[PDB]
DNA sequence: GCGACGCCCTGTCGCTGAGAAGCGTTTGCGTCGC
DNA sequence: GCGACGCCCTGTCGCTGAGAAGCGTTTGCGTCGC
């Protein structure tokens, strides 16, 4: 039961899913079925999240929406989706979630 | 895909699992379906495996046929079996199969 | 001390259930003679 | 050094793919006045 992590290329980023990066954590849309969720928040919603392009990651620990990107790591999302090596804080071992920082 | 950990009670421990315990690594019968996988020889087969009691454990790390708990840690399963507090070996911590000894 | 209301950077954790398995290439050792 | 054949305690590792996710109870802070 766990979502197959595909790794998009940088040149396949289109406007609309940058477009589609939240801007404000209350502006997130929900849906139980085409949402995505945030491993930071935890919140399974249809705004753009990041994509991690280390072949080793799994499963949806490398999917951060924007508010939490920024917030909790200084970093944008349209940066890290044009970014061909960008990594997720979880493979970099610098997640600060409620979960990774007590582990 | 991970195959649920039930814990059986020693009270509902039947003769014939007892005598169906593997006493030679040659006499195994393999089947895909009905078979047991022995977590130290990673062999699919019918033999009576171990069942780790510790509510904590899952999937299939806690079941070790007769000859391997006999041989790779100095344990009978007939008295794993009877043994309401007995855990596996990667519960306690001193798993040595091929996986778990270089991790 | 517990939570209101402004401020600016517009934000977060709890909980359950989760945490592989098994086919394939798989079976000890020591002392010999290839 | 690589693998045969006896011995006794009758035996084991490699590899692929595996390694949660998301609903619920969820949103910063400081300084006030309850
Ligand atoms: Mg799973
Ligand atoms: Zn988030
Ligand atoms: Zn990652
Ligand atoms: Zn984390
Ligand atoms: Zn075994
Ligand atoms: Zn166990
Ligand atoms: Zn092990």
Redesign the pocket.
Known sequence: ???PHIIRPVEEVTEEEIRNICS???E?I?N?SL???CH?????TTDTKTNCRNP?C????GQFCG??L???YGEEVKDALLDPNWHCPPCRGICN???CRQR
């Open positions: 039961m766990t979502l404000n954590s209350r997130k929900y139980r949402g995505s969720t930071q928040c935890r919140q399974k080793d799994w499963g949806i620990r508010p939490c920024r917030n909790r979630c409620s979960f």
